[PDB]
Each structure stands twice: as structure tokens, then as C-alpha cells.
Amino acid sequence: EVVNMKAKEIIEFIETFAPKDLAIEGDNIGLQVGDNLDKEIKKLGIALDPSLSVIKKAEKEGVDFLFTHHPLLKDPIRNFTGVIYKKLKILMENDIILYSAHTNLDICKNGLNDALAELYNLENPKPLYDNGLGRVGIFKGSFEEFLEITKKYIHKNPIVVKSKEVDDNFKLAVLSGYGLSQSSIKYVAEKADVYLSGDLTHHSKILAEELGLVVVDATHYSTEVFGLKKFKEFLSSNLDLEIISLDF
Amino acid sequence: MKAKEIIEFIETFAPKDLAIEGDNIGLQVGDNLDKEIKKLGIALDPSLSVIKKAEKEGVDFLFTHHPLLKDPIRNFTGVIYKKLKILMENDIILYSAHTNLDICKNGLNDALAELYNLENPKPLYDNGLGRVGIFKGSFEEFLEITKKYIHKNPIVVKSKEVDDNFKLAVLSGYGLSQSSIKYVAEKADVYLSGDLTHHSKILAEELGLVVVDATHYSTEVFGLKKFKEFLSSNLDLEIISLDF
Amino acid sequence: VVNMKAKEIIEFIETFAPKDLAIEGDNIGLQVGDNLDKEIKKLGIALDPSLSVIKKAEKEGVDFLFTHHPLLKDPIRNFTGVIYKKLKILMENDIILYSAHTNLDICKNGLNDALAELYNLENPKPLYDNGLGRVGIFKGSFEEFLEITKKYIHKNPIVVKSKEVDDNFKLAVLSGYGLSQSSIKYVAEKADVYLSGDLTHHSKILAEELGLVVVDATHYSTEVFGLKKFKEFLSSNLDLEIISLDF
Amino acid sequence: MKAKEIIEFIETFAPKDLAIEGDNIGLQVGDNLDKEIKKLGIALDPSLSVIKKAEKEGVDFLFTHHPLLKDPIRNFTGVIYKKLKILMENDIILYSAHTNLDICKNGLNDALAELYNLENPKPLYDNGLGRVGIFKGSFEEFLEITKKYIHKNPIVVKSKEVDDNFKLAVLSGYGLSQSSIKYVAEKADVYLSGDLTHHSKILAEELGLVVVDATHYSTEVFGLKKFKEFLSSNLDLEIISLDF
Amino acid sequence: NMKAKEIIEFIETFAPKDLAIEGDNIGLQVGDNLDKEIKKLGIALDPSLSVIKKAEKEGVDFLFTHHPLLKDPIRNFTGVIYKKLKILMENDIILYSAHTNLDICKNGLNDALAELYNLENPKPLYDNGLGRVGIFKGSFEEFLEITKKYIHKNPIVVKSKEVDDNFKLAVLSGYGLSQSSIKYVAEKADVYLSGDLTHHSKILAEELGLVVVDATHYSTEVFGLKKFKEFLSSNLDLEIISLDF
Amino acid sequence: MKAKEIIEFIETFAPKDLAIEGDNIGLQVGDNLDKEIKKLGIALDPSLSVIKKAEKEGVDFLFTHHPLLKDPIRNFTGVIYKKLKILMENDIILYSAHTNLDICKNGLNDALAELYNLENPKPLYDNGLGRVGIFKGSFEEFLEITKKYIHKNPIVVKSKEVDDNFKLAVLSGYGLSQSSIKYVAEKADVYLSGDLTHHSKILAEELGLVVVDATHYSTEVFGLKKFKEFLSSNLDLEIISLDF
Ligand SMILES: [Fe+2]
Ligand SMILES: [Fe+2]
Ligand SMILES: [Fe+2]
Ligand SMILES: [Fe+2]
Ligand SMILES: [Fe+2]
Ligand SMILES: [Fe+2]
């Protein structure tokens, strides 16, 4: 039986899986665009980004509730022109609800970071940061086995900054999305031998090389979508509601 | 005519660089400025009911004196959702001239200064806000003009007696903050503006500045009506007012 | 009827309205004064430490001047004009000036409680986290609420009738200036009717959009109501001549 | 020649007041600038491996494009300790020209502009960073030049089709921040720079700005080689490159 | 008799208020009516309590001080500041200050020092106009002797290096010996004459080889303030006394 | 002994979490802490001449009371260059216990308190800085103690007469800021500290607080000598003093 749900029921279910208070300070989570949460929902769409093409695709596929991992806006605005105008207009004239679980989806049990920790079967995993982001533990295997898993399940040509030789049973840190800032490299260099994340840039590569931290950039997109598919299939398994993905 | 032409006409009258630092002037809501405009609506406030009225009257371009938002947001729920939904669904352009319309020649403050026929008028503040000059008449005559053209029942804080030919300061809108009262007490005998509150009243009494609160609304709408008729004289376009 | 030392008056007042109830940054306590052993024959109560109030205190032989509002919110480092004239009257007459501001707003039976008890609010709770204001159910009609306002607070209150109000509605009260834009947004989530003072245009417009009915009974009157209660509380307990200056 | 003479030559080419606000340009590590210099080393980064190589090759004056530290410190441990110790015990001078070398005439951004032979080039930002102008040719010809001279396999974010004689913006190093994307989208059809990340890619696609990431390293090293060759041509001094 | 506002325009002609550095609390400290007639003007370095007590005792009407009454703003009046204001207000004594505008102006406190040492072709030491620097045409010992004879009998000398004749001398009246000041002046001079030396600044001067002479905050200012006092006495028909010097 | 063992011993005496907020305590300069230590040097200040003397005397672990840098830097030239070059090329560890050594039991302030035999001593400030208590004797006896054990000719600001059995506050180093004078005036009759300047002197006189400046150096070196003898008594290690 596939059935219609009210928006508020979907939201309460998502927030049971990924409570809002797990979100780190200042993260723009929750209702992005919407008014009435009693709205009946026929079709739930899941996306990584609330991009313009995702929102156009939501309109085309008759999506009533659009879930995105990333918030619509990180920085507040007071004028509505260009792209943000095009996006809000499509959402508002179609009364499409836009809702986000961001770092709360990263941090929660079986969330985006746990999905990575489980894929690599990390021994005794711990949160990588104090705020609960990322996971770290021992990878029980060779660097090459880790690489093959990375290539088979996450991304084919990952960038490897092979700063040093890596022995079997090494400490592996994972962080879905963008974990490769300079300050993150410095912090993680103390906690792990290998750091798997996304969005490598030049100064961070150089730093990783100086510190002997092996960094694997399997992209921002892929390291999050892996967990986001698990999330989608979790929702499909529990809600009798048509659910589609839009940018994955 | 097209929206960008209405906008260039307004910005010729009241240039954007006249706005004080940080004022959210210009385009509030809109994308295509080549859009043809049949009906222009003028409002003091971009309130929910004003926006509902614009939609109802087939307004294509909504001009307001106050910006839609002072403080930036990153979620769209409740009232702002309702306002944006009406504007966006109908492609109604929302555009504002705020302090640039206060400050410019023949703008809202010049309108008050001209109503009272101020002798040798000067900007009240360095940034160009407000006007001050001599009111060539008695206090009571100043009051009669106020009641006849701006507001029938102004609040008068009669901190001292006012002799004929006094210095009168005007500031359309909200000019009655505590720091304004202190500043204007040095420059004028009588201060005509809006939105008086308790502490500013006490302060004016202490300083001996006579303050006349003819309301925020009326002291702006007077000049805003002049602006509307100016637009009507120059633009071949249906132009209506929505909250005045 | 007898004379008291200033510090005895201060201790009685701070027993009623403890300083630690004051919100962050509030300039409460001693405003102007040195020696607190000074004997006090006449205590004067005022809402504002205005220039005319201070002149009246001098004229009536007030030794201890209590005001609800602090003399200064913003600190200064030059003493001219009005503040010069005021300090000179206080110092030349050695008049002690002391204030209870938000600690008097927040304390039990203080300015906000006075309003809550006046409207007989059912199960009142603090309106804001810092303890400012009160909110609860008004057991009656909107009309009965307005009459109480007109009978006890202010004759012609401004009413922003943003929506219809049914009997037994949620009423929020806040003595003084509670009508800022951010207050309207916050209180709109908590009550049907908001009674406070000092309404200005943008707040009025905002209240209308949110459906919050706003009643402006003025800054002065919504505080003086409780300030009269305070004055009577002092008179019942202190053997001392006590007058009011701006009410 | 003395270190101060090398410094004066570089600063004549790329004056320090051209550096943007807060940029840590000039002398990074050094004391005596009267010291005579036998071997000058040029590097993009003052990395630990670059500094070690400098010692091994007997470099006494080490020039880098990037400053040693952006953020100030007050403790000396770990990597920064190893770097300072090698520089200090060997009295190797470390000197940087950063954004002043990006902005100056024939500096890193001009070199890109000249490579693409931009028609009527202007600075991309007000502060002088980047260049923008017309590429007199097809997008494919533009790609071919990029592949031959800068990076064999650039990432192309093909947000839209690009017509011949399009507007090309170049910015050596990292010019692909989100605010940079939004800004450059109004000035150019194609944005050539380095260090593309996910949110910026998405933004570029939404805006129709075609972005070509030829890497941070390669888009700087191209001009840094021209700078090296200019030094070699004018200074009677051994000059080597260390990380390129 | 002359009015208070006339004394103020006279002082401000000598030392214009726009010369004061950003944020300096110069001008009218305590007072209302400036049409007030003034019989007796008192000059002081500090508006201290005892200076203000002395002002009342001597019938001073206009109290001029180099230092402002308050640097940091207040919003309560108790203890010492209550006592100072009470004396000024019940006696209607006007309190007025010229602070850095008096340090910086032509023939002001820093120029007074520069002239004492006959500095060859002097320039302002800081961009904002504070201090003076130039060549002292003589030996270090001759410089010390002038210091001992005219400013302070026994200055603290931090002798960080030997000093050759015809050296560069920087002077700054009052407190010029902060750590950031030592670093700055070390680039500009061989010898630094000022007041209020403390331990970290002393160490820093030794490291940089900057010779520092602390002839005290008080003396390096009172020297010029006496010249200022005689300047007023020569031009104003008015009884003028000094209170803490 | 290894460097880390010396550090663990010092931190047992003066725990790092006792330091006031932001105080730059701990490792200033050093990399390898398993290093065995040949000679420990103690200094008040990590000055240039102190560090030179350490090199000359073969000190490999240099302890100072004052941190090397309070304000972080990002360029390394002049004096700081000369200092780091010596520490780094000789691999000399530089470590500081600053306010944690001021506050800890038998630390610098306790040493003063015990010297004057303060009756029933308390911390002067909430954060644990300084000590205050009753001096069981005359002002003159206090002065005689000050002259014999701390500094001959201390500067005395004799703001009022001092009766026997007065309250004495002590603070090793710089305790004579204006806000400290105001604070201590409420708590003691006499304030013993260092680094007096003019405005503080005037302020003390206004408040009637008697202030004795026995100098920054000496009021700390007294306790620092006790600390040195404590280390010498407990560690099988050569220990010398460098600036005292
Ligand atoms: Fe992400
Ligand atoms: Fe307005
Ligand atoms: Fe109030
Ligand atoms: Fe770069
Ligand atoms: Fe001074
Ligand atoms: Fe110290």
C-alpha cells in the first residue's frame, strides 16, 4: 500500500532518526521553505543540494516534499533576485515544502558518518570531533584493501596524498563531505594515519604532506551520497509513501 | 513601459548613493527588469495587507518607502513566506526608495520644509536627513498648518513657550530617538517628527525642546503623496496608492 | 514617625527587590551618593530622575530620592548641561539618589506582578526567560479586559485590533516598554493580547501581520500602577515621611 | 650581490603597497639584509620539503610566492619548529611576494592574460586581482591553449555552451570561492582559476558560468616561471626553482 | 574681568582641539555657564582630589588640568568622583583640559623638550604628532647634565649601548615608554627621553640597544606646563597660580 | 632526567590549569621532549642576554617565569630572530610557568606572604593572584623587612598614616594598575608590588591606599629563588640562575 502522509509526520519521523539538537551550533537545519505543515504529501524527494536544477526536477516530477541534506542558505539575505528568486518562486507557486537535516544527519546514529565507518568496518569507532562530526577507528587491513573498498563503493579515481607509507591495521578517520580544511588536517594528523573525506585544495595537500597525514579525497559529493542513499532506503522501508532521489 | 525604466526614473529623482550607509534600498523582490508594467502601486509599508491589495488590484510594480526586510533571514516561513509567495507567483516587482527618498531634493523632508515655508532651510543632519530653518509666524500658526495638512491631533510636548519666528526642525518618519532629541535641542526650538516614546519625551522637557509628534505615518505620507503625483505627471502609467 | 539612615532604607528595598534579579547590564543601586549613614527624614518616590523631579525633590526637602529608572544608561566622562544641573542639585543638597529598575519589574509583587494580579491572570508565568513580563489566561471577555485597563491604568489606551479575541484568551503584560519589533514577534507566539507601552509604527504594522492584538496603555501608566503599590508597601512598613514626585 | 639588493629588485617589479589588506608579504625569516647572496631559490610554497631542499642545494635566499604563516603564533613546536630551525641555523633568508606579485604589471595574473592574448584586459576585482577580457577565438581553442601551457587535464564545469569571442576571466591560484563565483558570473562567460570545491561547482552551474579549474599550483607556476626567467635575465646570480 | 569662554578660546588658539588624538577626552570636563566671570585661574597637571581641594581653598574659579578628569566613562557617582564633583559644583568651579592637544601643538609640552635640548631640525616622532626627534648636537654626558639641571635630578638611565656624540634624540613628555613605543622608537633614535618606565619595557630597550632615560612622567610634563603657565600669565590680565607644581 | 620529566615535576608544583585565562604558559620552544637534559637554567625573563648566557653555559632546558611571546607574530626578524636561532640551533628547550607559578601553593605570592608572616592569608583576587592578611607589626618593621629581603629604597606612596596590625596585600610582579589600585583600596591598608606609574600613584593618594613599589623584578625574584632551591633540593640535576 502506497499512501499520502502529512508533512508534519514526515518531519517527526526524520527528526526521530536525526534529532535537531544533534546539529552543531549555527547550522541552518529544519524547515527551509514552507508554511502549512498539515499539507498532504504524495511524493517525497531526496537531494544532496537544493540546487536550481534539483528544484526544477522536483517541480517536474511532482514532488510535494523536498528533503535536502544541505540548507538552502547558509548566509542570510534581505533581497530576492536572480537564482534565489527562481528557486523560491518554483517552491512557492507549487507549495513545495523544503526541509533539511544537515549536520544532525551527519552526526546521528547510522547517519552519514556512521555509514562510512560501517563500510570500512572500523574497529571500536569514536566520534572524530568533540561536536560529534566524523568517526575514527582502526582499519583492520592493508592500505590497498582500504583503497579498493573506496574505489568500489565510493568513488573510482580518488585523489591520494600519499604523505607516508601506511602499515596494516592503521588508524582511519572518515568525514563525509568537506573535512579537509587546513585546521582539520592539523587536528586529524594527531588522531589518524589516513583521512578519508572530500574537497581537497592546494594548501591543505601541502600541509598534509608536511605532517605525514595520508589524505584521500573521494569527493564531497560521493562521501555524502553513500550515506544519503542508506537514508533514502531507510525512509522507503518505513514510510508507505512514494520516494525518489533527485541529484543521485 | 518596462520596469527598468520606472526604476531609472525613480533613481534619477532619488539616487541610490544618497541612502545612508546600510539602508536596504533598491530592488527588494524581482528578477526580470525588462518586464512590461501596466499598473504601478505606491505604499508606505510593504505590509502583508498592502501586498494582498497589490495582487487584488492587478498591480505589476509595487513601490514602497520602507524596505521589505531590514534584517537578513535564511528561512522562509510564516508572514514572509506569505508575502514572497504573492509577489513571486504574480511576478510583482517590489522596489524601495528609503532614506534616499528622505534626503533627496523635493524628497520627504524637503516636502515638510516646503509645507512650513522654512526660511533659509538647511539639512538637519550631516548625512542630509531632516531640514531646519526659520518658521516665519507664530507657534499657533505652525500648529494650524500641522493639523490641516499632516495630522489633526498631534502630540505636543510644550517644554517651553515658543516665540514667533522660531527655528523649526522637521524629520519625516522616526526622528524622535533620545540621541536625536539631544542633537536637535542644539539646533531648533521646535522639532516636528514622529514616533514619540516616554524617555524621549522626558528628555525634550529637560532640554526645553518643544516636540510635535504628528506620527511616523502622516509625516512621511505627506511627502509620499507629492512623490506619487510627481510620478503621475511624468509617467504614462496607471498609478494607485495602497496604504494611503 | 521617625528618621532613618539611608542604608536602612536600601536594605529594606533590596529585601523586596533583590539586586541579583536585575537583568544583565542594568544600572541598578546607588546612582548618586557617598555617605549612607546619612539620616533620612523624607523619602521621595519618582518614575524618572528627571530634571523637574530633582528640582521638586530639592523644593520639598527630600533626603532620599528613589527612582525606578536609572539616572544614566550610557556612561559619560564630561559633566555639562542637564546632567550638570542635576548632579549639582543632588550634591549641593546632599540628596541620595537610588534606583530599582528591572529588579523591581521582576520581583514578587513588583511592577509586572502588579499587572498580572490586576488582571487576575490564571496560572501566571514569566513572559521572558530573564523573568520580565507575565503571561496567563484572562478569565473574561476582551471587553472586560479593556474596562479593567481603562478603570485602573489609562483611560484611552491605543488598541491595535489585529484579530477578533474570544473570551478566556492568553494575555501578556509588560510594564513600560515591551513593544519592540522583536518583542512583538516573540509575544505573538505566546499570547492573543499584549498589554504594554510605547507603541511605534513598525511595531504596529508587525502586530497586525501576526494577528497579535496590542494595547498601548503607555509606558508611564503601566509602570506607575505598580509603583504606587510599591509606595504604599513602603509607607505601611517604614515610619518615615514618603511622597511621590511625578505621580 | 646583497639580500637587500635582491629585495629591492623584486619590490621594484612588485611594490608592496600593491598587496591587498592584511597580506603577509615581505621578509618572513631573516635578520641581516647586508648578507651577500650566492644562490637564490624560487618556490611556490615555503613547505618543509622545499626548505630542506633549499638547505641541501646551498640556497641562501629563498623566495616563495606564499607567506610562511597566515595566522600568527606564539609557540614553536612541530612542523614550524623544524622549518625555522633549518632556516635559522643556516641563515637562509625567507622572503615572500604574494598578492603584490599577483596584481603587479606582468605578474601572475597578467601572465595568464597575455598567454590567452585577452582583448582589452582589465583587472577582475577592484583591488587589482585577476584579469578579464575577450578571448578572440573558440572555447576549444581556449581549452587547447590551457592544455598545452597550464595543465594537461583541467576540470571543466560546462554550465552552458560558449560562443566564440567570449569574455574570459583568469585568476591565478584560488579564485573559485562561492562569492568569487557569484561576482565573476556577472563579468565573464568563462572563469579560469584553481581549487574548485563542490558548493562552488553547484553555484557555477546555477549561474551558467563556465569554470575551468587548471589547479591552484599550475595557474600560479606558469607566471612564477616567467618571474624566475625575468630575474635570471637581469641578475648576475645563480637562480633555481625548488617545487617547480 | 574676563569670562570663562574667553579663557577657553585663548587656550584653544594656542592648542586647537582638533590636534587631540582620537578618543582623547579634551575640553570642558565640568561646567555649564561659560559666560561666567573668572577672577582666579589655577593650573594643574592632575585633576586630583587634593588639587581640587586646594582649588577651593585658594578661591580658584577656573581649574585647568593637563589630564582629563576621566578616561573611562562612568554612570554612577560615589566615593572619590562624588567628592571631586561635589567640590567643583557647589563652588561652580569650571574644570577644563588640554591633554594631547597640548602635547602636540606648537610650543607645547613636546616642543618645550625639543627646544631645551636644542634638537637640530626636529620632526614629530609619531604620525599623530606626538613626541619630537632630532639630532642632539653634543655628547651624551652633556645631554644628561641638561636633563639633571632642568627636568629631574636623577633620571633612571637604561644604558643599553654606548652613545656617540651628535646622536639622535627622541623625547616624549609623560608616558612614552610602552613596549610598542620602545620598538618603534628603537628604529628612530639612539636615546629616548620620557617617563613611566616599567620592567618589560626596560628589558626590551636593552635587547634593542635603545638607551632609555626615565626623567619621570611628572617632570617631563611639568617642564612644559610651567612654560605654558607663564605664557598665560604674560597674555591674560588674570591671577594665575599653579596647584600641584 | 628527560625534559618531559622536568616539565611533569614543575607542573606538579604549579599546575597549568591554575594559570589565568590566555596566559601563554608551558612549552614556548622545543620539539623533542624525550631529550635527556644536561643542565637546567632558571631565569625571570627570556631576554636576549639570558638566552645568550644559556648557550654560553651549556643550558639545554631553559625555564623562564615570563612567556617568550604574549602577542602572536607571523614574521621572524630582529630580536626574536636572534633568540629563536640560538634556541633552535642548540636544541635548547624553553618552557614557562607564569601565573600558575604566581598562584600555586608556596609559589611567588605565597613566598611574599610567608616573608611578611601574614596572619591568616587569603588570595587577593578571585583568580588566586596575590595574598592579603594582617601584618603583626609596625609599618616601619614592614619597611625594614622590605629593605633587607626585597629591595633597598622601595618607592613608598605614603597616602595616609598606617597603624600597627594593618592589612597588607602583596602581589609579585606588576600589581599596580589603576584598576588594581581601586580594587585593593577596598581590601588592604598597604599594597606591596612593582611597576608603579604616575596615574596609579595619584589614584592611591586619592583613595588613601599606601603603595610600596619594591620593583617588578625583585618582588618576583624573591620567590623565584625559593623555587630554584626547591628544584635543586629534589632533582638530581645541575641547576643555575641566569638573570639573578
Ligand atoms: Fe556537504
Ligand atoms: Fe519611516
Ligand atoms: Fe520604564
Ligand atoms: Fe596561491
Ligand atoms: Fe601625562
Ligand atoms: Fe612579572
DSSP F171-211: EEEE---HHHHHHHTTT-SEEEEE---HHHHHHHHHHT-EE
d(CA F217, CA F195): 9
Task: Give the number of the ligand closest to the Cα of residue C176.
Answer: 3
d(CA A230, CA F233): 65
Q: How many CB atoms lie within 10 A of CB D70?
A: 13
Question: Which whole-number Å values give the CA distances from B198 to B202, C104, C218, E115, in the listed order?
Answer: 6, 18, 8, 58
Question: Which whole-number Å values give the CA distances from B66 to A76, A169, E127, F175, in the listed order?
Answer: 19, 64, 44, 55
| Whether D107 contacts D25, CB under 8 Å | no
| Whether D242 contacts D13, CB under 8 Å | no
| Length of chain C as a residue count | 247
| Cα D15 to averaged position of ligand 4 atoms, centre (Å) | 18
Strands D166-174, D131-135: pairing is antiparallel
Q: Determine the 3-state secondary structure of F150 from DSSP.
A: coil
| Cα F102 to averaged position of ligand 6 atoms, centre (Å) | 9
Q: How many CB atoms lie within 10 A of CB B152?
A: 9
Question: Which whole-number Å values give the CA distances from F45 to F42, F64, F69, F152, in the listed order?
Answer: 9, 6, 11, 22
d(CA E62, CA E47): 12
d(CA C218, CA C174): 11
Q: Which of E8, E211, E196, E176 is nearest to E104 (CA)?
A: E176
- The angle formed by the CA atoms of residues F123, F124 and F126, to the nearest 5 degrees, is 75
Neighbouring residues of D104: CB distance < 8 A, sequence distance ≥ 6: D13, D14, D15, D18, D110
Rounded to the nearest angstrom, the minimum Cα separation between D62 and chain F is 14
Instruction: State residue A74 phi and psi, 5-degree precision.
Output: -90, -45
| Cα A70 to averaged position of ligand 1 atoms, centre (Å) | 6
Q: Which grid cell is E68?
A: 582629563
Nearest C-alpha in A relative to B26: A79
First CA to last CA across chain B, in angstroms? Answer: 24
Q: Do A74 and B74 touch (CB under 8 A)?
A: yes
Q: Do B75 and A32 touch (CB under 8 A)?
A: yes
Q: Which of C197, C191, C193 is nearest to C225 (CA)?
A: C197
Strands A123-127, A135-139: pairing is antiparallel
Rounded to the nearest angstrom, the minimum Cα separation between B235 and chain C is 30
Question: Which whole-number Å values give the CA distances from E64 to A185, D82, F196, in the listed order?
Answer: 61, 59, 26
The 8 Å CB, 24+ separation contacts for B69-73 are: B69/A78, B69/A79, B69/B24, B69/B28, B70/A78, B70/B24, B71/A76, B71/A78, B72/A75, B72/A76, B72/A77, B72/A78, B73/A76, B73/A77, B73/A78
Resolved by: X-ray
Interface-testing mutation among A33, A59, A70, A78, with chain B (most B C-beta atoms within 10 A): A78
Q: Do F48 and E196 touch (CB under 8 A)?
A: no
Instruction: State residue F214 phi and psi, 5-degree precision.
Output: -100, 20
Q: Which of C229, C207, C233, C240 is nearest to C6 (CA)?
A: C240
Q: Which grid cell is F34?
A: 624525550
d(CA C35, CA A64): 73
Q: Which of F49, F194, F202 sits opposite E46 (nearest CB)?
A: F202
Set of chain D residues whose Cβ sits within 8 Å of the Cβ of A225: none
Paired residues of A65 in beta bridges: A44, A97
Q: Do E32 and C92 touch (CB under 8 A)?
A: no
Rounded to the nearest angstrom, the minimum Cα separation between B128 and chain C is 23
Is the alpha carbon torsion for E230, E232, E238, E239 positive or negative?
negative
Q: What residues of chain F have any CB closer than 8 angstroms to a CB in chain D?
A: 24, 26-31, 67-78, 81-82, 84-85, 88-89
| Cα E206 to averaged position of ligand 5 atoms, centre (Å) | 24
| Cα F29 to averaged position of ligand 3 atoms, centre (Å) | 57
Q: Do F89 and D89 touch (CB under 8 A)?
A: yes
d(CA B27, CA B4): 10
| Whether C132 contacts C102, CB under 8 Å | yes
Q: Return the residue matching grid coordinates 654626558.
A: E141
Paired residues of C135 in beta bridges: C125, C172
The rounded radius of gyration (Å) of the Cα atoms in chain A is 19
Q: Which amino acid is at F215?
A: T
Q: Which grid cell is D67?
A: 607567506
| Whether E75 contacts C73, CB under 8 Å | yes
Q: Which of E48, E67, E196 sits opposite F197 (nearest CB)?
A: E196
Neighbouring residues of E186: CB distance < 8 A, sequence distance ≥ 6: E205, E208, E209, E210
Q: How many CB atoms lie within 10 A of CB B122?
A: 12
Give the CB-side neighbour count of residue D131, counting CA atoms within 13 A. Answer: 25
Neighbouring residues of E180: CB distance < 8 A, sequence distance ≥ 6: none
Q: Which grid cell is A59?
A: 517541480
Q: Do D174 and A210 touch (CB under 8 A)?
A: no
Set of chain C residues whose Cβ sits within 8 Å of the Cβ of B174: 200-201
Rounded to the nearest angstrom, the minimum Cα separation between C244 and chain E is 23
d(CA A140, CA A145): 9
| Whether B207 contacts B187, CB under 8 Å | no
Q: Determine the 3-state secondary structure of B197 from DSSP.
A: coil
Across the C:E interface, residue pairs with CB atoms under 8 Å apart total 73
| Cα E187 to averaged position of ligand 6 atoms, centre (Å) | 26
Rounded to the nearest angstrom, the minimum Cα separation between F174 and chain E is 9
Task: Give the number of the ligand closest to the Cα of residue E203.
Answer: 6
Q: Which grid cell is C43?
A: 523619602
Q: Determine the 3-state secondary structure of C178 from DSSP.
A: coil
Q: Determine the 3-state secondary structure of C33 from DSSP.
A: coil
Domains and CATH numbers, chain D: 1-98+216-240 (3.40.1390.30), 99-215 (3.40.1390.30)
Set of chain A residues whose Cβ sits within 8 Å of the Cβ of D195: 201-202
Q: Do E73 and C76 touch (CB under 8 A)?
A: yes
Q: Do D74 and F84 touch (CB under 8 A)?
A: no
Q: Determine the 3-state secondary structure of F19 from DSSP.
A: coil
Identify the chains in contact with F, defined as 3+ C-beta pairs within 8 A: D, E
Instruction: State residue A104 phi and psi, 5-degree precision.
Output: -65, -30
Q: Which of B84, B52, B59 is nearest to B6 (CA)?
A: B59
| Cα E219 to averaged position of ligand 5 atoms, centre (Å) | 10
Set of chain C residues whose Cβ sits within 8 Å of the Cβ of B195: 200-201
d(CA D102, CA D44): 12
| DSSP code string of chain D | -BHHHHHHHHHHHS-GGGSPTT---EEEE-S-SS-B-SEEEEES---HHHHHHHHHTT-SEEEESS-S-SS-BS-B-HHHHHHHHHHHHTT-EEEE--HHHHHSTTSHHHHHHHHTT-EEEEESSTTS-SEEEEE-S-HHHHHHHHHHHT-SS-EEE--S---SSEEEEEEEEE---HHHHHHHTTT-SEEEEE---HHHHHHHHHHT-EEEE--HHHHHHHHHHHHHHHHHHH-SSEEEES--
Interface-testing mutation among C30, C67, C88, C101, with chain E (most E C-beta atoms within 10 A): C88
Q: Which grid cell is E129?
A: 604628532
Q: How many CB atoms lie within 10 A of CB A176?
A: 30
| Whether B55 contacts B88, CB under 8 Å | no
| Cα A25 to averaged position of ligand 5 atoms, centre (Å) | 47
| Whether C67 contacts C36, CB under 8 Å | no
Q: Do A219 and D205 touch (CB under 8 A)?
A: no
Q: Return the residue matching grid coordinates 524621549.
A: B200
Q: Do F31 and D77 touch (CB under 8 A)?
A: yes
Burial environment of residue B224 by CB neighbours within 10 A (0 to 12, 13 to 18, 19 or more): buried
- With an 8 Å CB cutoff and a minimum of 3 pairs, decide whether chains F and E touch: yes
| Cα B66 to averaged position of ligand 2 atoms, centre (Å) | 6
Set of chain A residues whose Cβ sits within 8 Å of the Cβ of B68: 78
| Whether F175 contacts F194, CB under 8 Å | yes
Q: Do C76 and E74 touch (CB under 8 A)?
A: yes
Q: Which of E31, C214, A81 is nearest to B4 (CA)?
A: A81
Nearest C-alpha in C relative to B49: C209
Q: Which of F68, F69, F75 sits opposite D27 (nearest CB)?
A: F75
- With an 8 Å CB cutoff and a minimum of 3 pairs, decide whether chains C and E touch: yes
Q: How many CB atoms lie within 10 A of CB C232?
A: 11
Q: Which grid cell is D94?
A: 625567507
Burial environment of residue D100 by CB neighbours within 10 A (0 to 12, 13 to 18, 19 or more): buried
Q: Which of E69, E75, E85 sits opposite C27 (nearest CB)?
A: E75
| Cα A194 to averaged position of ligand 1 atoms, centre (Å) | 20
Nearest C-alpha in C relative to B208: C82
